[PDB]
Amino acid sequence: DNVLPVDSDLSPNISTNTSEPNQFVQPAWQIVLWAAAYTVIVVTSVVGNVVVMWIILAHKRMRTVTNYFLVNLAFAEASMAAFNTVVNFTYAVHNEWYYGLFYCKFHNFFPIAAVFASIYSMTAVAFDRYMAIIHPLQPRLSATATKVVICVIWVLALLLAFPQGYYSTTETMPSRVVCMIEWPEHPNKIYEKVYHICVTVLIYFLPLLVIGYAYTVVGITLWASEIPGDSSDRYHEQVSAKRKVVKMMIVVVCTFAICWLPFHIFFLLPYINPDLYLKKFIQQVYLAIMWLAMSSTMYNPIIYCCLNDRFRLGFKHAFRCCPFISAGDYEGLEMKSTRYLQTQGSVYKVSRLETTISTVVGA
């Protein structure tokens, strides 16, 4: 059933993804279809993620530790839109890996790093949520640490992403020109088999479990129920506000799992039964999921807008060059003081709370 590519070479038709078009694998139009999907994605992913990164940096008020983690996520998405999607697009219209083996490596490595980093960052977010809920004590926490933490996630991400570059597994996806870890063969010199189990479980699965677990602990504490006003089942507006953040974080995770999980499952199943067909082992299946994972890059900016008024209002401030932020503003801390932005609403040295300075702000 299999050749180096997913299709059988009953005919001599099969040709290397590096050398020629893969038109035999799927209809040519399907190639343009995937190319089309990528092109549109590039626009959305770039604009949305840039907006997120831009807005939080631009608006002084949105400086939360969580915001730091989100920039990290946004950054990971940006790399996808700039780095990975572009190559994936070129290939698609070419119908194969014009770039050749070196590039397959470059292209797989960066995209792999992006996926690993995302799930790992989501875990940090989960843990931080747990910490915020149980121990509101603000001082046990530092912005500086967050940067350190973010860097750490990247380091671990490299731990999986980089070793394939080290003599380890390698390869292109079903129709593909997307490159990923070598699930198909057990290229012995390469020691593929070991790498495969290790990577999925350690990088994707374990972090998924932790996020799930941390999620459960949060269940006892702040839950979905949150009354819009501070009053009612909320003990302080800040407490009531936080519940909003947690819910978005939950949705962010959910969307993440839905997008990626199918790929990871297919990752493993072919590992167990390579050279065979799953329900059907084909170009189409592997392809659909990996490209689907790419869509994730776009979803987070949408969730933010829908999910939180603060970003929504603050973003709008950014969109219209001037303030022009009608629509009711944040009606809370657009900024703590009032409106928030680089300028405009976010007044220098935003106000402080408590005789002492409760939040590390107004420093």
């Binding site: 299999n2 050749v3 180096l4 070479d9 290397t16 050279d275």
Partner: peptide
């Protein structure tokens, strides 16, 4: 029993 990758086969 997938066929082995051929270096020469690659163009």
């Amino acid at each position: 029993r997938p066929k082995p990758q051929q270096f020469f086969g690659l163009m």
